Structures are given as structure tokens and as C-alpha cells.
Amino acid sequence: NTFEKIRNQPLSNFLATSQVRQNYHQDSEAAINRQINLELYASYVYLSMSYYFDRDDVALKNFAKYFLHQSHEEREHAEKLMKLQNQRGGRIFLQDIQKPDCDDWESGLNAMECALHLEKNVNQSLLELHKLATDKNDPHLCDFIETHYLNEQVKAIKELGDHVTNLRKMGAPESGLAEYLFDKHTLG
Amino acid sequence: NTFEKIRNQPLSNFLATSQVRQNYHQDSEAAINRQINLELYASYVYLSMSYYFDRDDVALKNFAKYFLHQSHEEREHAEKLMKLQNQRGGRIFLQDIQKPDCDDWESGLNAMECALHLEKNVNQSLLELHKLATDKNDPHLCDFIETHYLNEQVKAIKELGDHVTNLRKMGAPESGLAEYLFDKHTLG
Amino acid sequence: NTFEKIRNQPLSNFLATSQVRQNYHQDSEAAINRQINLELYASYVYLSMSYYFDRDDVALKNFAKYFLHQSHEEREHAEKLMKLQNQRGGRIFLQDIQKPDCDDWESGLNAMECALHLEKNVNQSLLELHKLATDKNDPHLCDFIETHYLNEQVKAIKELGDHVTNLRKMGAPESGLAEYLFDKHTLG
Amino acid sequence: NTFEKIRNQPLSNFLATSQVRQNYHQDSEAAINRQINLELYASYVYLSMSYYFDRDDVALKNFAKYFLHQSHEEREHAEKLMKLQNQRGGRIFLQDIQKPDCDDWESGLNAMECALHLEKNVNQSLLELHKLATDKNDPHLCDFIETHYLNEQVKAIKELGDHVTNLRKMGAPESGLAEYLFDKHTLG
Amino acid sequence: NTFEKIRNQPLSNFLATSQVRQNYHQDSEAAINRQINLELYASYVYLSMSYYFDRDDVALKNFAKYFLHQSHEEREHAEKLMKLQNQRGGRIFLQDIQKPDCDDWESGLNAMECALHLEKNVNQSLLELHKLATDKNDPHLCDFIETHYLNEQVKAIKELGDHVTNLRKMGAPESGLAEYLFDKHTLG
Amino acid sequence: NTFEKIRNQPLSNFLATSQVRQNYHQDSEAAINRQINLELYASYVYLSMSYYFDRDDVALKNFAKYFLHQSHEEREHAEKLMKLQNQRGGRIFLQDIQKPDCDDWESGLNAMECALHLEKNVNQSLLELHKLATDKNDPHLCDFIETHYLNEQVKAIKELGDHVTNLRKMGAPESGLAEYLFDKHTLG
């Protein structure tokens, strides 16, 4: 899985004085760069799924629309992180964006499960970032993280869990009628 | 079952001269206090069910909305009874509110059946209250009960019976598709 | 005083794996259940006071309106706590709601003083809850508490203190003219 | 600079039971009084600069407008701090307001640099205050500071840095054309 | 009082050629600087009183609002004087702003009396300034003073006298009912 | 240089029967996949350039806005290509997205020159794609390319050339006044 490989690289890989810098450790800068890379990767995965559900032998439009919306959201998250990095006086440092691990998904249920897994991973990364911020006595960074990311992660995870439960109860993936009706009524 | 043990307590437990009191027996006062306690208990049960249907492994929003509405209705009923007790010149006397008997419900059908049972019990209590009022020659109390409670009870019971019948015919509780579609089309 | 007896019960009494649970200790779950019970109790006390001030030998309408509004607010607080408990992946566990300790209040000043006492107690409970959350490294819970409860508690306490001071200076409770005019001008 | 002299006075020089006080250490009270004095001093400095840029031999209107706006902002900050001190149950204690250190400024660039210096000093003081609050277990005060001051300080510092960079690149202070055009296009 | 101490300092302490200067003696410049300092001091005193009347053991909102309005008015007066000083080709020269003499006021009547005293002092200062202007043959300065300050001073003094008389007749400060009703009806 | 090494890879690397496929050679499929990768790379380069000009020691807002707009445009281009690939009955096959080659740009002129170079490269790739389409007798693909890409490329190249010429004539990069005024008047 590409996620842990991105995770286990040292902070030295994410580093490239300013007149506005004040109370800003370099480890925080390094962690912010890595988080940026992670958000971009998530956006790319969502795009891949969205255009998978558009093939002529799958043909579920609302799934595709949903995943495209998610991809755009992830892109905006990454841009906001970059803006913060500039505001505080650090230096942005970019890396390659890996290709997604899964190429086909075979059903809507499987795609929803992979999405849930991905969101949980992103949440774990954010939590460790907050811990690193708090043991360095940086209240501004802690408040930024708390106000802009944690509640959104929690809500997204809850929604994905609801979707998975509903799809399992209706009889998916063996019943195509189930996925058709779910695409019509819930995601419509 | 909490209902009957609340019912079987003597009237002396629900008792705590006024310048407005006229033709108002104390047995009526005690019965009104008891009915207040009963309505509060019903509201609490409805709240419990409503938030049961919100868990991530059940995920049926319209059921939860329906039951929350019912809970608010029961609260208003209790408040109106308290206002009457003050209007006539009695003294309000409160008691504890017991916890609901059932903790999990396992399906929408089971919850609907328990709700039907509860409503029938409340109706029986109201009928006994009306009989007590009428054999004491208190026309104002009788008319109050008739105009504000009996028809509402009848309509609620009819609606719950319709819901139970429809759910049984569609194949519940073995078919999750049935409950999904019922949540979409009827309660939506 | 029922409050401290509710406070002193162990966390095990407030406990009844999920696919959305992540970084959520069970002690937090128990504490949330206890706080829910506390908020419900406060709502019930406010209701009792509100309908006390409606008797024919007291007759102060604006006091009753004020306390009824407070009761509804407490109910919404409890509902929001329940929604959080579901969002994070815990299990709600309900208890009995005790009857209020004071049955008569004899004046508006005495009622205001009891309300101030109650609000201070609720604030203390919230503070120790936040401490428990913070020594377990749960930033989402800490931010939730901070953003939704502490400032409201502070504002409510300040307002109640102002009311008590004004009522004492006007000559209450020996002067009924004072309470009449306060009901007209301040709470009107 | 008057700044570090104000900073180095003991907390005893900023102190002058309440029925609303709860979980409020006196060191926090003293620190709040000191911060109030600091904000007033900053407002006075901004006023002095604003009216310096209005002389007939300088004649740059938009600079004056900008600095006057800053002065009013600082005044509102101080008033909000005083309101908090009253809300929590402390006692306000005022001191003298010293005169600004610099009397002439000789250019727009020099004034912008002094303003940047001042803002950085204020930010440092706020950070020390937050540390003091957090090691005393006062979550309400910490959240107040985080929500109302830190992000504003960061944004102000970033904006001032941008202004200084742009002015240096255009050729100031040796070119009056540069300052004229900057006054027209950026601050207009 | 601090007032006479500020008054008795020589004009040389308030002094720091222009192409617009014409018929403008330096004694006038010094007197204008002194008047600026005086107006700032008055604004600061008004602010102190306004936030005294906001404490939880005083709790009279309309008094606080009134005094805050007065403080803002004094600030605008000072700013207009500074603009005048710039128009005629003088040089502004600032001083420290002393802390108010009275720290507590104990009643609304006492605060109103102190305010009346302060306004009378300011009026006396303005009168001596006008005399100095007129014996130097400076018609523009005389007309400026007459058109912008004297009538406002007279109206303010009359209003404060009315307030003091009304408060004394109602029975203040021994009757808190008097101050409550005055806050409601007159200042409301 | 990433561009030509992406260009020189064989078509076999960009390959992963359908009921809608008709007159669609596999070489066209591979070329479309390669073009998709190229467009994504261009978008990423534009994003980096845009956030370079946001640093506190560069501070040219309109440049950043311009480049961000360009990045979004490139993203939409890639999405349209993917939609075509699905419409015709091929299979999408994704690859890694390399990091940009240049990390700093040192001036607006240098950035404009790099952008011109990049656009010319993209145009060359599109031209050889059209040649491959036309020697395979695929009129639909040829018309798609002609109607959606060539004129846009030509217009973009013309505009970038105009910008470069204007910046060179004004005296850039040695004159910062030139870049300031160009940012104000042309890109504003």
C-alpha cells in the first residue's frame, strides 16, 4: 500500500531566514509538506474511481458524480494547506504523486469500502500531526488543525459507514437491482 | 413492564384553600398528576427509539425523524395537562421518570409494534380517567378530555396499524429491501 | 442534593466493535452518558420552576416564560450530546430521571439563586469532563466541548448574577412592588 | 523601547469575593490587565503615525487613512479584553499610557518597518499569555485567546511583510515616485 | 487633581519654517498641544467609568452605554484639534496620559457629579484658550473655538445638571429602586 | 527535462471486447492515455508556479491568480480527454505524475518564458497525435482534436508572447517598478 510507504519516509525528505517567521519549528514544516503530498494522492485516487464508474459496462452515473465531487474537495484541502505554509513563513517542497493501487473495483460496495479505508488513514495522519504540533507549544497550528480538519473527517467517516451498511442490507453485490435502486434514491 | 406498575399505585401517592376552586374533587387532582407522569414517560421512550434508529449499523433516517416528532408531541400533551391543573386550582406534584423497558429494537417492524402497544395503553388510561370524571359530575373535565385527547388517540392507533400491516405484507423483517423502500416512499 | 449523588456514581454504571470507531476510549463514553443524564435532570427542574410561577396565588407570567425557555434549551443540549455519541461510534445508555429537590420557591429571588447554583454545578461537571478528555489525547472531543458549551455556561452565569444583584438592590423579597416592576421592565 | 519595560514589571503591579468567580487564578487577572495596557499603548502609537503622515511637507493621504484604521482596531481589541475581565469576575486596574518612542518617521518604508516590529512584539506577549493560561488548566481562557487573537496577528504580520517587500523592490526611499505610486495603487 | 497639575505646566513643555504658516504665534501652538492632552485624558476617564458600571455587582447597562458614548465623543474632539494644528502649519507634540484619579464611584449619582465637575474644568480651559487667542489678533482661531466647542460645552453642562437634580429628588443614593427606574426610563 | 522522456516511452506502456467499439485502433488508445498524463503534469507545474508568487518576499498577487486559473484549465482539459476515451470504448490507464523540473523562478519574466516553452511542447504533442489519427482513417478523432484543442493552443501561445515582449520592453527584470506596474495594469 502506497500510504504507509509515504508515511515511513523521514522528515528530511520533506524539506527544501524569513522576516515573518516566529515560533515555527522546522519539523512542523516537514510534516506539513508530507500532508500536502498525501492530500494530492487522495484526490487522484478519487478521480480514478469516479471515471471507472462511467464505463459503458458499469453505467452508474450518480456514483461517478459523487466521487468527482470528493476529488475536488480533496484538491481544495491541499491548496489551503499550501496557503498556510506560505502564511507562516515556510518553504513548499513538492514530490511525485504515485498512481493508485487498485485499478478496478467490481462493484459500488467495494469502492465504498476502499473509500472508508482511505479516509481512516488520512484521519490517523492528521492526529499524529496534531500531537507533533502540541508537544512543540504551537497553539496557532493546533487551532488551525482543530477548526478545519477533524470534524470534517469525522462526518465523512460516519457518512461512508452509513452507505456501506445500507448497501449490505439491501443484498449487494449479488443483486444488481439493489445497486440500481441505491443509485436512484440515495445518491440521486 | 413499567406501565401497569405506574398504573396500580394508589391516588394518595400523587397528592402534594384556593380562591378559584369550585366543584373539583381531589381524586381528579390525583388522577391528573398520574396522567402527567405517564405522558412524560411516553415521551422519554419515543426519544430512546428515535436515537436508536440513528446508529451507524442501522442507518434509517426517516424512522428517526418520525419518532422524534412523536416525542415532541407527547411533551406538549404533558404541558397542556399541567396548564389545566393550574387553571382549575389544584397543586402539581411530580415524580421520577423511569427508564424505558426495551433497549434495542432489532427492526422497524418491532419498533412499530411496541409503539402501537404503548398507544393502546395510554388510551386505556384516558378512558378510565373519563369514567372517574363522569361519575363525579364534572362536565368541564369531561368535555376537556373529549375535545383534546380521544380523537387524537384513535387517529394515532389507526395510523400505526396501517404501518404495521404494510410492513408485514412487503416481507419484513427478513427483507432489508422492504424496509429501505418503506423508509423512502412512505415516511419520506 | 441529587446532583452530587449523580456525580459520585462510578463510570461502570453508565456503560451498556464498530466500523467507525477510532481513538475513542470507553471512559469518555461513560462520561458522556453521565453528562446526558445530568442535562435531562436540569431540564426537568427548570420545567418545575416555570410551572410553579403560574399558580393563581403567585401570578408572574414573565418569570414562567423565562424558565420555560431555559428548559427547552437544556433539552436541545442533551440531544446534541446524544448525536455526538452516535457520531463517534459509542452506545447510548439511559437511566432514570430523578425528581427535583425543591418543591416550592416562595419568591423570584430564591428561584434565581437556585438556578445560579445549578448552573455552577453543571459548569464544574463540564470542566472535569474536559480534563478527562485532554489527558487521553482526544483533540476532537476537547474542541467539541470548547466550541459548544463553555462560553454558553459563562454567559448564563453572568446573566443570572446580574439578575440576582438587581433584585436584591430593589428591596426584594419583602417588597412585592419590586418583583412586580422587575417582571414588567427587565423580563418583559 | 517602552515595550520591554512594560513587559518586565511584576504581576503584582497589575492587581487592584465575587459570586460568579469559578476556576480563575489571580495571575491570569494580572496578565489580562497588563495586556490591556499594552493594547492601549499600541493604539496611541498608531494614532501618532497616522497624523504624522498628514503634514503639509509629507502629504500622503492613504498612509494616514491606513494607520488611523489600525488605531481604531487596537482600541476595539482593548475594549473586548476589558469585557472578558468583567465576564469572568475579575477587577480591572488601569495604569498610565506612555508616549510613543519615535516622533518622526522620515518615510513610508520606515513607518511600515516600525509597525511590523510592534506587531511582532504584541504577538510574543500573546503567546506568553496563552502558555500561562494552559499551565493553569483554564480551557475557556485558552479557547478565547485562540479564537480571537492569534490568526489576526498572523494575518497582520503577513500583510505588513508584503508591503515592506514591495516598497523595497520599487526603489524606496530614494525614489519619491515609488512612494507616490504605491500610495495611489496599493493603499488606494 | 491631575487636571490642575496638567494645567500649571509652562507652555514650553508642549513645544517640539513651514510654507503655509501665516499669522500663527507659537504660544497658540503650545496651548493647542496642551488642550489635546487634556481631551485625551477626559476620554480615558469616561472609559473607566463606563466599564465600572458593567460589573456583576452593579449591573446598570444604560449608564455604561451612556458613558461609552461620551468617551467616543471626547476622542473625536481630540482628533479634530490635531487636524486643526496640522492645517495652520504647527507641529504636534504628545505627552503621557495619566490614569484617572477615582477608581470606584459607589453610585450613579456620584459618577454624574464627577462628570459635571470634569466638564466644568474643560470649559474653563477652553475659555482661557479663547482669551489667549483674542489678545494675539488671530480671528480664525477665535472663530474656530466659538463655532466648535463653546455651545457643546454649555449644552453638556446643562444636561448633566438636569440628571443630577432628578436623581437627587427621587431619593438616591439610599433607594436602589430610584436608580433602577432612572436607568429604565430616562437613559433607556 | 521530464517532457521528452515522457514523450519517448513506447505506446505499450500506456495500455492496460466492448459492445460499442467501432473503427478504433489501439495505437490511438495508447496515445490518448499518454496525452492525459501530459496534461496532468502541466496542471501540476502551473500549480507550483502559482504558489511561488505568493511568498512574502515576492508578493505579486495577480501573477498567482493568473497561474492558478491556468492550472484549473489544464485539469478540465484532462477530464475531457478521459470522457472521450470512455465514449469511444477504450480503457483508461494511469501513471505517476512527476514533480516539476524548476523549483524557483526569480522573476515574472522567467516564469512567463517557461510557460511559453511548456505550451509549445504541448502543441507539438497534439500535432503528432493528429497525424497519427489521420493516417489511420479516423475522422471522428481528427475532428474532435481540431475543434477542441488547436485554436486554444494557438491563442495561448500568442498571448504569452505578447506578455513576454511587453515585459522585456519595460525594462524587466532589473527594474522592479516595471513588474509592479505590469502586475497592476495588465493582469489586474
Curated annotation (Swiss-Prot), chains A, B, C, D, E, F:
> According to UniProt, where does the site described as Essential for association with cargo receptor NCOA4 lie?
R34
Cell compartments where the protein resides:
Cytoplasm; Lysosome; Cytoplasmic vesicle, Autophagosome
Reaction it catalyzes? 4 Fe(2+) + O2 + 4 H(+) = 4 Fe(3+) + 2 H2O
What are the GO cellular component annotations?
autolysosome; autophagosome; cytoplasm; cytosol; extracellular exosome; extracellular region; ferritin complex; ficolin-1-rich granule lumen
Q: List this protein's GO terms for biological process.
A: immune response; intracellular iron ion homeostasis; iron ion transport; negative regulation of cell population proliferation; negative regulation of ferroptosis; negative regulation of fibroblast proliferation
Highest taxon above the source species: Eukaryota
User: Where does the Ferritin-like diiron domain start and stop, copy by copy?
Assistant: 22-171
Disease cited in the entry: Hemochromatosis 5: A disorder of iron metabolism characterized by iron overload. Excess iron is deposited in a variety of organs leading to their failure, and resulting in serious illnesses including cirrhosis, hepatomas, diabetes, cardiomyopathy, arthritis, and hypogonadotropic hypogonadism. Severe effects of the disease usually do not appear until after decades of progressive iron loading.
The protein, known as: Ferritin heavy chain
Q: Which organism is it from?
A: Homo sapiens (Human)
This protein's encoding gene: FTH1
